[PDB]
Amino acid sequence: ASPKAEQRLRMAAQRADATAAPQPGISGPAPAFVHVIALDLAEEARKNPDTARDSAAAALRSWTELAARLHEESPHDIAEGAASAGLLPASLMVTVGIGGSLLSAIDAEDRRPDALADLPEFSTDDLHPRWCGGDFMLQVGAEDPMVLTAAVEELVAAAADATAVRWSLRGFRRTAAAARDPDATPRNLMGQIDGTANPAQDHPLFDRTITARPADNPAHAWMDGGSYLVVRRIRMLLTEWRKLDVAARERVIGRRLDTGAPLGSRNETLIPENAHVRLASPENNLGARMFRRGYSYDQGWRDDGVRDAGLLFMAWQGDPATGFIPVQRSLADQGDALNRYIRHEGSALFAVPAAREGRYLGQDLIEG
Amino acid sequence: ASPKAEQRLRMAAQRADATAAPQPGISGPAPAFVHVIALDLAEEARKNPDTARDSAAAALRSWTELAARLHEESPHDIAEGAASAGLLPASLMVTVGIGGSLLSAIDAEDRRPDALADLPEFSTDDLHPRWCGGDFMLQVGAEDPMVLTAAVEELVAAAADATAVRWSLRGFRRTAAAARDPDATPRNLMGQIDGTANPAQDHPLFDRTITARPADNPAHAWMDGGSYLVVRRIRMLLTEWRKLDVAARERVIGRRLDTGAPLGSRNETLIPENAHVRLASPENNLGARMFRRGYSYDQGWRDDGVRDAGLLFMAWQGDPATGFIPVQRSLADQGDALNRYIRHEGSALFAVPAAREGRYLGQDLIEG
Ligand code: HEM
Numbered sequence: 001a002s003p004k005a006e007q008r009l010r011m012a013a014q015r016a017d018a019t020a021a022p023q024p025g026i027s028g029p030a031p032a033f034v035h036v037i038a039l040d041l042a043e044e045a046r047k048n049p050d051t052a053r054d055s056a057a058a059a060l061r062s063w064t065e066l067a068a069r070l071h072e073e074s075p076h077d078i079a080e081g082a083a084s085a086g087l088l089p090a091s092l093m094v095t096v097g098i099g100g101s102l103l104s105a106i107d108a109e110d111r112r113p114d115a116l117a118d119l120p121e122f123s124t125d126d127l128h129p130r131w132c133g134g135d136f137m138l139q140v141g142a143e144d145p146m147v148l149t150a151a152v153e154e155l156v157a158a159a160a161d162a163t164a165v166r167w168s169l170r171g172f173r174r175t176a177a178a179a180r181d182p183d184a185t186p187r188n189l190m191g192q193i194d195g196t197a198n199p200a201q202d203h204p205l206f207d208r209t210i211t212a213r214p215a216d217n218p219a220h221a222w223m224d225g226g227s228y229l230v231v232r233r234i235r236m237l238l239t240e241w242r243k244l245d246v247a248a249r250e251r252v253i254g255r256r257l258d259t260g261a262p263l264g265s266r267n268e269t270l271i272p273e274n275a276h277v278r279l280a281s282p283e284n285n286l287g288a289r290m291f292r293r294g295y296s297y298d299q300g301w302r303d304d305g306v307r308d309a310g311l312l313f314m315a316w317q318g319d320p321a322t323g324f325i326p327v328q329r330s331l332a333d334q335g336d337a338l339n340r341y342i343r344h345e346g347s348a349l350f351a352v353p354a355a356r357e358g359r360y361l362g363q364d365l366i367e368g
Numbered sequence: 369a370s371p372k373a374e375q376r377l378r379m380a381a382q383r384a385d386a387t388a389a390p391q392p393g394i395s396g397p398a399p400a401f402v403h404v405i406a407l408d409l410a411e412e413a414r415k416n417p418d419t420a421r422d423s424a425a426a427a428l429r430s431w432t433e434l435a436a437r438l439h440e441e442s443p444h445d446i447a448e449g450a451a452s453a454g455l456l457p458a459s460l461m462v463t464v465g466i467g468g469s470l471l472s473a474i475d476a477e478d479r480r481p482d483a484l485a486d487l488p489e490f491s492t493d494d495l496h497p498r499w500c501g502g503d504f505m506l507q508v509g510a511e512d513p514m515v516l517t518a519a520v521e522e523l524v525a526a527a528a529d530a531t532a533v534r535w536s537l538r539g540f541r542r543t544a545a546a547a548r549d550p551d552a553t554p555r556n557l558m559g560q561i562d563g564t565a566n567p568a569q570d571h572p573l574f575d576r577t578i579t580a581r582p583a584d585n586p587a588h589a590w591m592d593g594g595s596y597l598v599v600r601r602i603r604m605l606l607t608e609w610r611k612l613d614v615a616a617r618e619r620v621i622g623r624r625l626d627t628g629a630p631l632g633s634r635n636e637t638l639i640p641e642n643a644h645v646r647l648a649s650p651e652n653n654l655g656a657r658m659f660r661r662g663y664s665y666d667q668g669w670r671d672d673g674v675r676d677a678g679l680l681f682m683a684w685q686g687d688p689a690t691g692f693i694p695v696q697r698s699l700a701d702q703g704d705a706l707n708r709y710i711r712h713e714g715s716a717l718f719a720v721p722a723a724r725e726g727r728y729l730g731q732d733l734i735e736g
């Protein structure tokens with residue numbers, strides 16, 4: 001035994017905080033596994049605003065109610081014969097989001113806040129249309145992949161009649177069980193420390209960065225206190241990346257691989273003109289800031305021997321126009337050193353509304 | 369702290385047994401994650417026996433030597449900037465196998481033992497050709513997915529010039545960190561306890577089941593004391609499976625979901641005529657026996673909304689003709705109750721030779 005050992009087990013052992021706002025899956029410790037699932041209203045229902053809106057109401061209610069249960073109970077408490085029987089709670093958490101395309105389907109474009117405007121095209125884009133967008137999102141996280149997939153099955157089933165999967169991707173980070181130091185910042189498939197410059201969660205900057213400011217227009221206020229998720233599936237050119245020596249890799253980002261220190265320094269907590277962290281800095285983007293909570297993905301190999309692995313990148317912010325968008329535009333247009341080694345292949349924006357007492361998620365938007 | 373807690377951490381904390389025979393990745397405790405990678409000799413080299421055989425020698429030597437290092441060191445000890453830096457050893461283990469197609473490429477059909485004859489077609493087959501076969505195999509296992517993918521990168525890179533990935537699949541089981549009882553038999557995506565009837569590893573039946581008996585012909589003796597791996601990618605029809613009530617599910621297999629006891633009993637440690645365990649029993653197959661060491665897989669959803677998830681099934685045996693083959697033939701032809709809910713979509717047979725002092729894996733076969 002040891003303190004560190006107890007600490008290595010905590011993420012697997014504990015339930016998540018079901019009260020975190022706007023919803024679970026943003027603040028608090030990040031579980032090791034994630035499944036991001038984009039869904040559309042079922043084809044037939046989607047054809048007409050009225051059936052579209054009924055199916056959305058059903059989907060969103062079922063999910064809300066099941067996310068409630070899954071935060072206090074495990075999948076195997078909810079149903080007999082689940083894959084997760086005999087397992088600890090593993091920080092299971094569920095987040096539900098709404099795409100701008102949902103508003104189109106239900107004829108509610110009047111309800112679309114400016115912050116939910118489609119993402120612009122970026123000059124480095126290499127997006128696959130089937131990996132873009134979606135009427136809804138489920139983000140499901142857990143510290144154990146079996147607990148994860150059991151919860152996914154129940155959540156997809158709860159809205160099976162009303163929705164269809166559009167795209168999905170599983171991701172991972174180091175397990176707390178295998179971290180020499182389970183409080184250390186996790187690394188990505190490029191070997192880099194990933195997360196250092198996020199605003200600290202015990203600091204007012206966190207909530208300010210994440211939280212949608214009140215809407216001027218009551219038709220847009222269903223997103224007050226919510227957050228916006230930009231998800232990007234970013235393939236890493238690892239074979240080419242591995243040809244670089246360590247110094248060169250460090251120059252691409254502007255931080256060292258060993259410690260995560262900016263270049264020329266000793267601690268995590270000179271920089272090339274085209275370095276990622278220089279071009280991405282709020283400083284270089286009129287104060288644009290986001291909270292990044294991304295996962296690695298490993299999908300083996302594709303045609304013609306291309307490595308299908310990467311960063312399932314996820315940025316949270318109050319308004320994409322003062323977060324992800326200006327920053328990505330700087331990285332795209334100003335020639336981030338990193339562009340060479342990455343390809344943006346999937347993209348989506350989801351509005352993630354604040355949970356409210358006595359109402360299902362997005363009930364305001366649906367109404368009733 | 370507690371004994372169970374220390375036990376939950378052990379798989380992440382320890383190195384694997386590098387001395388287990390024929391190779392690592394068969395006996396001992398099974399790590400939570402696996403990556404099964406089938407590779408072919410590179411296209412140009414493969415065209416002619418002489419360059420084929422040179423590239424095979426290179427591939428097999430590099431892999432052997434790197435598997436050696438990876439059993440005593442972690443990927444981040446082998447190279448700077450690895451994705452696994454700062455992580456515990458996580459039971460990393462590497463297994464190398466050889467397909468019968470390799471023997472064709474190197475013009476060594478004389479060397480093909482009878483046990484390495486291609487698997488027959490089965491009546492329930494639904495195999496995708498790109499997911500079948502392969503000249504080589506790498507099986508890489510670890511308790512942490514980040515440790516896993518770091519080791520994979522180094523192993524694929526070590527033979528990059530000489531080989532190309534043909535197909536691959538990642539799988540998982542419950543993590544030891546999240547098991548209420550980390551010694552309990554792991555479950556599958558159908559909720560079932562999976563592994564009960566395997567021969568016990570502290571029992572002579574284990575080695576007898578696994579181990580290739582000596583070859584009559586010295587040209588075939590390179591597999592003496594080795595083992596044969598049948599891998600099948602088996603998709604589960606989970607949506608249809610979940611329509612059944614618990615009793616009905618239990619009738620398909622012949623064991624209970626809660627405890628894994630045969631039907632009508634209390635302990636893991638009446639049965640329908642078409643029950644899986646009845647038709648699969650050595651009893652129903654002239655004593656045919658295998659060691660099953662499979663993993664779940666979750667690949668999200670495919671066209672047209674089909675759930676791409678399943679069992680990455682792996683059977684080890686001394687000779688497929690007295691193991692996997694007769695048993696699968698009984699399940700296929702005698703109408704296993706389970707057939708309804710599964711589809712065999714990928715298949716391969718690999719010869720996994722015994723490690724020998726002072727020689728690389730399969731050096732006998734290559735010679736020199
Ligand atoms: C595969 C793609 C990417 C990789 C590998 C990557 C990697 C990194 C690394 C290693 C850091 C430094 C450590 C840290 O502060 O977290 C970092 C920082 C950052 N990244 Fe990325 N990143 C990627 C894509 C993006 C994208 C698409 C955006 C935004 C559009 C973004 C925005 C940022 C920001 C804002 C910082 C912090 C800069 C600062 O204030 O110092 N990154 N990234």
Ligand code: HEM
Pocket residue numbers: 556558560561562563564565566600602603604621623644645648649650658679681692695696699710
């Ligand atoms: C998705 C496919 C499959 C599933 C879900 C499945 C599931 C199970 C389960 C739950 C058991 C009982 C627990 C145990 O003893 O391990 C079992 C036993 C067994 N399975 Fe499978 N199985 C599958 C495919 C296969 C295949 C393809 C083979 C061989 C060709 C096979 C051979 C066996 C054998 C030999 C036993 C032990 C029977 C005994 O002696 O009692 N299984 N399987």
